[PDB]
Amino acid sequence: RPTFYRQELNKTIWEVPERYQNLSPVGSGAYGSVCAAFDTKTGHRVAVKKLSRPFQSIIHAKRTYRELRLLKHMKHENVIGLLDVFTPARSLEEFNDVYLVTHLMGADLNNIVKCQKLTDDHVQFLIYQILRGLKYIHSADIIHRDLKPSNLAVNEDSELKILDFGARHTYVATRWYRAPEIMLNWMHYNQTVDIWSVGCIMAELLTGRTLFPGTDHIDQLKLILRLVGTPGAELLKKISSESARNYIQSLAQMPKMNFANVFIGANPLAVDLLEKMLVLDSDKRITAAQALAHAYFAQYHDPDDEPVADPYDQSFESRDLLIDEWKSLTYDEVISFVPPPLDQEEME
Ligand SMILES: Nc1nccc(-c2c(-c3ccc(F)cc3)ncn2C2CCNCC2)n1
Ligand SMILES: NS(=O)(=O)c1ccc(N2C(=O)CCC2=O)nc1
Ligand SMILES: NS(=O)(=O)c1ccc(N2C(=O)CCC2=O)nc1
Ligand SMILES: [Ca+2]
Ligand SMILES: [Ca+2]
Ligand SMILES: [Ca+2]
């Protein structure tokens, strides 16, 4: 058994194996907080997330299980996955803390390294990586639902990973990148909710400005309609609230803008891709796999290196179990974790 040590980080005691050294805080994550660390076994830099009160309630307990299951399944170069998972507990009866370990990424997309402005080739690379990660998670029936720059971890070489993907049950989050069907609680939607978000992110990389910086959900909707035009009646089918439908229907009709008049001087291929992503008709929205084939990414696209995921069993999501049952299932997942090899890639 490894020796653990205690260190106060973010005003609370972390208990970590001697393997991980020089911890220092690098911000909060979903339901936890994160430290950079040095892995003395491999000489690699890692990020360690300590979950916050993982078994305090039935909500925390199931979300702890959910996150550990999800991260144990994610094995893709543009998606956060696990190098390690640990607990100081020596038995289930002692088990009350969960730490997740992944490769250290320096920043998020808001902090991407650049020289004055991003070149189009660099924007291609950033968006390509998001879409490659989305193809993978979508193939396992996992949707992000809140994709945005702060949920894209980026390192010093602009390599990018999606994180905080895939909550059922209830900090002020930005809504500027959320798909309309999510922000307004429409009755149904598909995996292309995340493609809307990609469009919002890519637009901002091209212009340097937020695409839809609404002050509230009505202001944001108005900004959206000014770009994409007034929807048809069929879209009202998706909206439960009569007051919301009546309001939208009452708005003065707006024409769709030609995106070439909006993203001035952009690569025409970038404009065309944005036209395919920023669609209110989510059944006409391009999918991640389709976007990867778009000519905008021609210099990066490689079908042999755009894999899909193994099947992911989410049957647990429909189940209500007791707190100690989720805790025991989580403990099982900690104990059964098998670390990946340090080098899992080979030349093409
Ligand atoms: N610096 C860095 N590097 C990799 C990941 C993270 C990370 C994690 C996280 C997730 C799982 C895991 F096992 C370990 C860490 N959760 C939030 N973040 C950060 C993402 C960038 N903004 C600050 C929080 N942070
Ligand atoms: N990879 S490790 O060497 O840092 C490590 C960390 C923690 C642990 N551990 C647990 O998770 C439960 C009991 C225990 O000993 N084992 C190895
Ligand atoms: N906010 S804006 O309308 O002034 C604006 C700013 C920047 C841009 N743009 C460029 O300069 C290169 C590509 C692109 O889209 N377009 C519009
Ligand atoms: Ca290749
Ligand atoms: Ca190799
Ligand atoms: Ca090949």
Contact 175, 183 (CB under 8 A): yes
**245 C-alpha vs ligand 1 centroid, how far in Å?**
39
In the DSSP assignment, the letter for residue 307 is P
Q: Which of 277, 339, 331, 263 is nearest to 93 (CA)?
A: 331
Helix (H) or strand (E) holding 290: helix 288-292
Q: Whose CA is nearest to atom 12 of ligand 2?
A: 87
Resolution (A): 1.2
Q: Whose CA is nearest to atom 7 of ligand 3?
A: 207
Cα–chain-centroid distance for residue 169? 18
Count of C-beta atoms within a 10 Å radius of residue 110: 11
- What does the block give as tokens for 266? 């952009």
| Ion ligand 4 residues within 5 Å by Cβ | 302, 305
Helix (H) or strand (E) holding 323: helix 323-336
State residue 85 phi and psi, 5-degree precision.
-145, 135
CB-ligand 2 contact for 86 (6 Å cutoff): yes
Helices (H) and strands (E) in the chain, counts: 10, 10
91 alpha carbon, closest ligand: 2
CA distance 286 to 123: 19
CB-ligand 1 contact for 163 (6 Å cutoff): yes
97: annotated active-site residue: no
CA distance 45 to 106: 10
By most ligand atoms within 8 Å of CB, the mutation choice from 127, 204, 207, 212 for ligand 3 is: 207
Give the residue ranges of the annotated binding site for ATP. 26-34, 49
Count of C-beta atoms within a 10 Å radius of residue 222: 14
Q: Cα torsion at 135, 110, 225, 164 (round to 10°)? A: 40
Q: Which of 343, 307, 329, 344 is nearest to 137 (CA)?
A: 307
Helix (H) or strand (E) holding 227: helix 217-228
Query: Please, which experimental method was used?
Result: X-ray
CA distance 7 to 214: 42
CA atoms within 13 Å, Cβ hemisphere of 31: 26
Closest atom, ligand 1, to C-alpha of 105: 3
Taking each helix axis from N to C terminus, what angle separates 323-336 and 58-73, rounded to the nearest 10 degrees? 20
Burial letters for 49-71: b for 16+ Cβ neighbours within 10 Å, e otherwise?
A: bbbbebbeeeebbbbbbbbbbbb
Q: Which of 152, 262, 131, 150 is nearest to 198 (CA)?
A: 131
